[PDB]
Amino acid sequence: SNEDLPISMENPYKEPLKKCILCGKHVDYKNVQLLSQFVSPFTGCIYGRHITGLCGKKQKEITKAIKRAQIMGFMPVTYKDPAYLKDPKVCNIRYR
Amino acid sequence: DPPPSTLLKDYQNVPGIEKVDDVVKRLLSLEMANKKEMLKIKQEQFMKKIVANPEDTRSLEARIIALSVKIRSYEEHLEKHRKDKAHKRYLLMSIDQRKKMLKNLRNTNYDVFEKICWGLGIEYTFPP
């Protein structure tokens, strides 16, 4: 009938759905190095998702892993292990 | 309860499963599986023993068999957790639902209803 009329399709220009840094990666309570990347260096508090930039599922995984490691003796509770203070910062917190 | 040596429902039909190590067989047996797998084995046994089409699950007979296995699981659970009010409620609700299913089956297909009652040991008592 008419070829210039718009066609029914999806959005070919759709930008990729942003993926959390941990998407597709296995959060384990033994990976204390990864877990310490989401705990405050000074108080040991677990950062919120507004700081970690994690999806809900990965935030819950991180929290459960941190608690399990802390109670199983893999991770300090009140502070970040000093061995990991110099790891790639991935948290949107600026104390100074 | 099926013997602990029984295989899981998914592996009972894999070819050559009789030519694997005793360790592999024990890994795939009900001994190294939770109670849900044992309940599934019970359910398949009952379906084979009663229903005319063991491969059909949407039928009311299959529904009654599955619900009876669930009721047995709840009764076993409450034998040990006597103060589990949530599972007591689930058990009573499941008994009521099985009564309703049996009522419908009795009204529709009586011979199948008798077969179900005999197989599952259910006595269909009329409501007061």
């Binding site: 210039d4 009329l5 220009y13 | -």
Partner: protein, 99 residues
């Protein structure tokens, strides 16, 4: 053989352009107020950029410049609003002058 609205829309440069994000367009300063340059770039709206500190005098009415578009229109919905609030102007970055 008269072009229809469908044909015109299909073959228009704006339609040929995809999303207006990070697209280099040629704007034309049509109004200047202090260091604010109102630039029209063929969209429905204009972009109000700031006279670059370098070559500032070179930016005068009618000057044709290069913009990197970020949004044809600056609109967004806010808590409780039933319809988008629009500031009636595009978003673009002034990359310099076209010669």
């Amino acid at each position: 053989n008269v072009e229809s609205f469908a044909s015109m829309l299909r073959h228009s440069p704006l339609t040929q352009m995809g999303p207006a994000k990070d697209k280099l367009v040629i704007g034309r300063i049509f109004h200047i107020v202090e260091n604010d340059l109102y630039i029209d770039f063929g969209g429905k709206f204009h972009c109000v950029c700031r006279r670059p500190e370098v070559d500032g005098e070179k930016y005068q009415k009618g000057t044709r410049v290069r913009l990197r578009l970020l949004d044809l229109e600056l609109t967004s919905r806010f808590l409780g609003a039933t319809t988008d609030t629009t500031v009636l102007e595009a978003n673009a970055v002034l990359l310099g002058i076209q010669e």
